[PDB]
Design a protein around this ligand. Structure first.
Ligand code: GTP
Ligand code: GTP
Ligand code: MG
Lengths: 155, 431, 431
């Protein structure tokens, strides 16, 4: 099965191996045991080129894993701003909610990726979105004392 | 001769001991090298004599660190003390009672006992020991209580008198000082026959207004403390009729062995800058002995009852002036004694004026008086300590520092219970 | 209690550690060659605390420089005092850790940690009265965090009675946007809770905020942050390098500042806040220095003290100033902000005054506080950790080095209990 090979080729960042497996019929939307797609692992490990070649060959930009994490969730969490913009331009749900109530704005705010926060707000991120604990991205900024993030959310 | 051995534990005990022995030599006319030109009687209770006419104090200086005692080894009285009587460790108890009692203190206690035994072997008839130590220090509380326990075994018949430094926040160096104070009081209670507390706050305040010292330091406090301690031990080093030995201290001031904390009051305390002050009369200094602001421990004897009261005068004091001044106190002021005690004032007069130390903040006085009284109002000082103990112990704060140095946590409650019984002991006497 | 063995692990540990030696050597009058060049006796009174006297008035810093990548080997020598470090104390590895906490704690760092313990033993056995160890390191990396905590555990197992002090640098996305740093910090904090006696929380989040907002530095560099660190490390260690009575050693400071074993993470503060290359007439008054020490914009950790309660506080004042004025301003802030101090620990604020101010300053004020508000710092790292751990992001980097996944949950559980402990004592009343 070439799905497990494409999964690890997308994680390791082997662009040439991703293009070869795709031509050999590898499941682009294959999932590991956690439900992670090659687009998930590509967006997690900062492989922008593999992210683009995946979306160009039928990758579900809004695929969710077992915990409901989208590639935008992980890209905003790890802080790959370039992958975040590419995912958003390909139809990524900016307000996707995972199993913990977190939106891509929540993870970008918690991790201090202020530039990703500004891009998510520009693309329609719901500031009123609450996690499972009743906290919004603005609530996290106040609770953590992150004044720089609070001013960004106030625009 | 009925000799007395002084023991100075910790920094407070050593520094105050250094000020006391400086004052003793000045009172007895002893040069810093130990030579006294005016004969070489009664001063022998505190000083031994060598073949070369050198008078060595019967003093032991013990500290778990050498910094403070090295000042005595390289001070003005470097040649005065026996060099082997200056015992130092390398690591202090860190403000931990358990360190000075259970761990670090055990590494030097047997050496301290052997050096004390060497001094006791030079005594014809040892009275006992005067122990100088702090309440809040790890050594002054931990090692002292351990030393008091050991002295009770090797010298069961000898008397043990304490000069204790009550903690005060203005000069305090540790937050666990209420712990160390309560822990050392419970373990020393049965091993001490008489303990003169020195409230650092009372001495601090007297230095502030009575001496016009803005920020008093240990030097200012120790010079005043040594003035009071010398007034208490003057009867042991001079001829007299009141408190001639350590046994009389318990007989006159200690009706029950548990309530052995007499309140000391000294008067007058005049700044040296007012050298031309008018000489205060016997009645004025005697009335100042009942003013709460002249006392060594912050309390209100008007709120308590007297079980004993000794008046030790120094200087131009005619005994008929004491009786007249005492007859006015008994009549004018409502000074209530306990019903089971003679409503009387024991009076001892040393007709030599008090000696002022050069460099001190005290002025020369023609007459002074130190009042030793056992009043139930000193339980207020215990209450202030026990409250600070209860506030911290309720949350078990800083307790881990003590259990980590070979001390079970039950000793905290066992010491706190004994203090609750001590406060109760003051209640059954005066209601 | 005199000599301290300094250790610096990782890039940040050696960077802020070299700045520590550069700052205190200037205060002690020690030039990079190791000779004395000052004109004050207080600079040697306790010079053996951090320096070893070598040959011909040469003071070699008792420091050990550790790292996994050899790039920092030439980085310290490129500095001013790079030649003052002993070449024997340079224990560096072949390959770095790459921000992998497991690489420093289990694989690469564990392979080289035995070589560091050899130099630690060589410096410790050359100590007359070693009081403990101090370690500068960051928590976000792999060497200073993963191996630093391993060095702490192995040194504690070898010297259990010694004080384990650390200058730990908390990570922040404002300074380094590396997402695995919450992993390394949480695993390190789990180790610091069990194996250190005193930890100075130097939060990079607060360092960036002071430079960006207060100092008005648009682009603050590591030198701008380390300027605040070196000023803090010099202030918090003032009582250890100069003659004093309060907190003069690592254990007495720990006994006074650590009421509970796990709550040993201090919030340091410095006043006045100054940037390098731009110092101006400070002329800060004692009340201005007092109000700034307890201000949140002056805290080295991004925590609002007004949101928590002070368990213990040690204030250090440097420079020539009125001792009485410091006592009044200290008692005034405690009166004005009475609700911000725990009531069940009386006299929990301790004040020390040193006559030697730091470089380029006439008046200085250093704050050392054990505040329950430090949970805000731990909660921020916990939320960043939980955000990463719930998605299992980059978890293979750690488990690939033989590290168990349950160690992540155990570290997160322990830090969550630490936050719960601070909140528990934040809500406790005297009743
Ligand atoms: N009056 C007076 N009090 C002192 C002096 N030195 C210390 N104290 C007080 O004693 C307490 C501290 O105990 P120390 O005597 O310094 O300590 P120690 O007995 O040497 O114990 P460790 O050093 O902790 O092992 C505090 O309450 C101080 O205010 C002094 O010279 N005079
Ligand atoms: N304040 C301050 N933080 C620093 C400095 N150098 C690194 N850091 C912080 O330390 C963290 C990274 O740890 P480092 O010390 O660089 O790493 P290390 O301990 O050398 O470990 P490896 O490089 O992974 O082998 C990040 O949070 C950086 O912001 C410095 O000079 N000052
Ligand atoms: Mg001491």
């Amino acid at each position: 099965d070439l799905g497990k090979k494409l999964l690890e080729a997308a994680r390791a960042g082997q662009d040439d191996e991703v293009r070869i497996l795709m031509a050999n019929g590898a499941d682009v939307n294959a999932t590991d045991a956690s439900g992670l797609t090659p687009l998930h692992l590509a967006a997690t490990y900062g492989h922008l080129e593999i992210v683009e070649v995946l979306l160009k060959h039928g990758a579900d930009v809004n695929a969710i894993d077992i915990m409901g994490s989208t590639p935008l969730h992980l890209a905003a969490l790890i802080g790959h701003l370039e992958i975040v913009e590419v995912l958003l331009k390909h139809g990524a749900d900016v307000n996707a909610v995972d199993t913990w109530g977190d939106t891509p704005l929540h993870l970008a705010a918690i991790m201090g990726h202020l530039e990703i926060v500004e891009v998510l707000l520009k693309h329609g991120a719901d500031v009123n979105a609450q996690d499972k604990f009743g906290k919004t991205a603005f609530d996290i900024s106040i609770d953590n004392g992150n004044e720089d993030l609070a001013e960004i959310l106030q625009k | 001769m009925r000799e007395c051995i002084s023991i100075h534990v910790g920094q407070a005990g050593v520094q105050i001991g250094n000020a006391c022995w400086e004052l003793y030599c000045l009172e007895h006319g002893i040069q810093p090298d130990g030579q006294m030109p005016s004969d070489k009687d009664s001063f022998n209770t505190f000083f031994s004599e060598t073949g070369a006419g050198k008078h060595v104090p019967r003093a032991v200086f013990v500290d778990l660190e050498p910094t403070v005692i090295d000042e005595v080894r390289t001070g003005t009285y470097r040649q005065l003390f026996h060099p082997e009587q200056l015992i130092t460790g390398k690591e202090d108890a860190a403000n931990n009672y358990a360190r000075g009692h259970y761990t670090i203190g055990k590494e030097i206690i047997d050496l301290v006992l052997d050096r004390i035994r060497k001094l006791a072997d030079q005594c014809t008839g040892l009275q006992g020991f005067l122990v100088f130590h702090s309440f809040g220090g790890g050594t002054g509380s931990g090692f002292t209580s351990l030393l008091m326990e050991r002295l009770s075994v090797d010298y069961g018949k000898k008397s043990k008198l304490e000069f204790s430094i009550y903690p005060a926040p203005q000069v305090s160096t540790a937050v666990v000082e209420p712990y160390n104070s309560i822990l050392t009081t419970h373990t020393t209670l049965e091993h001490s026959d008489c303990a003169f507390m020195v409230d650092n706050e009372a001495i601090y305040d007297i230095c502030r207004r009575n001496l016009d010292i803005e920020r008093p330091t240990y030097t200012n406090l120790n010079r005043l403390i040594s003035q009071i301690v010398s007034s208490i031990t003057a009867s042991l080093r001079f001829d007299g009729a009141l408190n001639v030995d350590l046994t009389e201290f318990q007989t006159n001031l200690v009706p029950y062995p548990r309530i052995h904390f007499p309140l000391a009051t000294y008067a007058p305390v005049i700044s040296a800058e007012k050298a031309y002050h008018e000489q205060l009369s016997v009645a004025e200094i005697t009335n100042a002995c009942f003013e709460p602001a002249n006392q060594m421990v912050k309390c209100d004897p008007r709120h308590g009852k007297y079980m004993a009261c000794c008046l030790l005068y120094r200087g131009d004091v005619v005994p008929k002036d004491v009786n007249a001044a005492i007859a006015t106190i008994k009549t004018k002021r409502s000074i209530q004694f306990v019903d089971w005690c003679p409503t009387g004032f024991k009076v001892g007069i040393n007709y030599q004026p008090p000696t002022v130390v050069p460099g001190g903040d005290l002025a020369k006085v023609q007459r002074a008086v130190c009042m030793l009284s056992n009043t139930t109002a000193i339980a207020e000082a215990w209450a202030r300590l026990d409250h600070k103990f209860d506030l911290m112990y309720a949350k078990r704060a800083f307790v881990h520092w003590y259990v980590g140095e070979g001390m079970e946590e039950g000793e905290f409650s066992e010491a706190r219970e004994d203090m609750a019984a001590l406060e109760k002991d003051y209640e059954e006497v005066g209601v | 209690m005199r000599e301290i063995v300094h250790i610096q692990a990782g890039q940040c540990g050696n960077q802020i550690g070299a700045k520590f030696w550069e700052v205190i050597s200037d205060e002690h009058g020690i030039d990079p060659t190791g000779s004395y060049h000052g004109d004050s006796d207080l600079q040697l009174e306790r010079i053996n605390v951090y320096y070893n006297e070598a040959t011909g008035n040469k003071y070699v810093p008792r420091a050990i420089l550790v790292d996994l990548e050899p790039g920092t080997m030439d980085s310290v020598r490129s500095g001013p005092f790079g030649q003052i470090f002993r070449p024997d104390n340079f224990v560096f590895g072949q390959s770095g850790a790459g921000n992998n906490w497991a690489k420093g704690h289990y694989t690469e760092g564990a392979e080289l940690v035995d070589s560091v313990l050899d130099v630690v033993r060589k410096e410790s056995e050359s100590c007359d009265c070693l009081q403990g160890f101090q370690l500068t390191h960051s928590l976000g990396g792999g060497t200073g965090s993963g191996m630093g905590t391993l060095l702490i555990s192995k040194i504690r197992e070898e010297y259990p009675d010694r004080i384990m002090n650390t200058f730990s640098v908390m990570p922040s996305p404002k300074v380094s946007d590396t997402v695995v740093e919450p992993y390394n910090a949480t695993l390190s904090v789990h180790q610091l809770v069990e194996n250190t006696d005193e930890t100075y929380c130097i939060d990079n989040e607060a360092l960036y905020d002071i430079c960006f907002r207060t100092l008005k530095l648009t682009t603050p560099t590591y030198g701008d942050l380390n300027h605040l660190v070196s000023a803090t490390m010099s202030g918090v260690t003032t009582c250890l390098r100069f003659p004093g009575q309060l907190n003069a050693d690592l254990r007495k400071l720990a006994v006074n500042m650590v009421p509970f074993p796990r709550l040993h993470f201090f919030m340091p503060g410095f006043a006045p806040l100054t940037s390098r290359g731009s110092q101006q007439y400070r002329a800060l008054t004692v009340p201005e220095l007092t109000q700034q020490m307890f201000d949140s914009k002056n805290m080295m950790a991004a925590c609002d003290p007004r949101h928590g309660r002070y368990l213990t506080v040690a204030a250090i004042f440097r420079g020539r100033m009125s001792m009485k004025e410091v006592d009044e301003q200290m008692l005034n802030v405690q009166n004005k902000n009475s609700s911000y101090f725990v009531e069940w620990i009386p006299n929990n604020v301790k004040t020390a005054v040193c006559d030697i101010p730091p470089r380029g300053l006439k008046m200085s004020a250093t704050f050392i506080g054990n505040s329950t508000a430090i949970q805000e710092l731990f909660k921020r790292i916990s939320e960043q950790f939980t955000a990463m751990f719930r998605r299992k992001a980059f978890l293979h980097w750690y488990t690939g080095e033989g590290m168990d996944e349950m160690e992540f949950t155990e570290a997160e559980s322990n830090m969550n209990d630490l936050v719960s402990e601070y909140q528990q004592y934040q809500d406790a009343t005297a009743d």
